[PDB]
């Protein structure tokens, strides 16, 4: 709602976008795995290893 | 309308017969946006009328349309605190539209216990001159001829 205490005819809409990317690595070389482990990424980007 | 005349939609022709009048009739009888159901109603009523009368459905359709289409209409306007009725001629397109509208409205209010039957009987009565649409047009022309004294207003 735009404002408190009634006044409901007007509202606001908000959005939250999250981008998901897949990096399918083949031939998991241990050197590559260690590099991925010790490479630092910005907090805005989350890395999941599975 | 204030800026000027708006464009008119390009109505498409009926493939089953080839008459835009059938398309106009189905569009007018459309209720709650059921196009296929309305078309089925129209086809069934037309077939029933055809089998009752033993003639050409399109031919009788144009016969009824020409019999019931009007020529004059009454308009209302107030001058000097008094409300008067002024008649004015009507163009053929609006005449046909009003004829179809009257046909549908007076088919609505019959007592044959079945609408697919009521529509066909109303079409037959309009064709033969015993229709409620014919009576409505009679009354309209009577009123126009009675109140055409105020034609000098020309509005």
């Amino acid at each position: 709602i735009r404002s408190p205490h009634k006044y409901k005819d007007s509202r606001e809409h908000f959005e939250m976008r999250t981008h998901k990317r897949l990096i399918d690595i083949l031939d998991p070389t241990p050197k590559t795995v260690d590099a991925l482990m010790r490479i630092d990424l910005p907090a805005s980007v989350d890395v999941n290893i599975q | 309308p204030r800026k000027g005349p708006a464009p008119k939609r390009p109505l498409v022709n009926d493939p089953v017969y080839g008459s835009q009048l059938v398309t106009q009739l189905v569009n007018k009888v459309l209720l709650e946006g059921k196009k296929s159901l309305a078309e089925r109603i129209v086809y069934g009523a037309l077939e029933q009328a055809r089998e009752k009368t033993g003639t050409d459905p399109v031919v009788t359709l144009k016969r009824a349309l020409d019999n019931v289409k009007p020529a004059l209409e009454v308009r209302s306007r107030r001058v000097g605190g008094a409300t008067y009725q002024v008649p004015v001629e009507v163009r053929p397109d609006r005449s046909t539209t009003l004829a179809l509208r009257w046909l549908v409205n007076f088919s609505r209010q019959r007592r044959e216990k079945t609408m697919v039957e009521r529509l066909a009987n109303e079409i037959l009565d309009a064709s033969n001159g015993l229709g409620a649409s014919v009576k409505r047009r009679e009354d309209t022309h009577k009123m126009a001829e009675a109140n055409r004294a105020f034609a000098h207003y020309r509005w």
């Binding site: 709602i1 908000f14 959005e15 939250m16 976008r17 | -």
Partner: protein, 60 residues
């Protein structure tokens, strides 16, 4: 919001059915989102200040 009551709500209730939201910043009982833990006006303020990581104006 009465601070006595907000602290009381924060305190563990004697029963499981006596727990509710109580927006943290202002302690508004009504109209509070579960995910953010904030109410309508608090969410408005944080989003407009841009201090909430992920909220933005929506126009599609």
């Amino acid at each position: 919001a009465k601070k006595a009551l907000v602290h009381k709500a924060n305190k563990k209730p004697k029963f499981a059915v006596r727990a509710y939201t109580r927006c943290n910043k202002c302690g508004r009982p009504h109209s509070v989102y579960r995910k953010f833990g904030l109410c309508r006006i608090c969410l408005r303020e944080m989003a407009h200040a841009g201090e909430l990581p992920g909220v933005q104006k929506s126009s599609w």
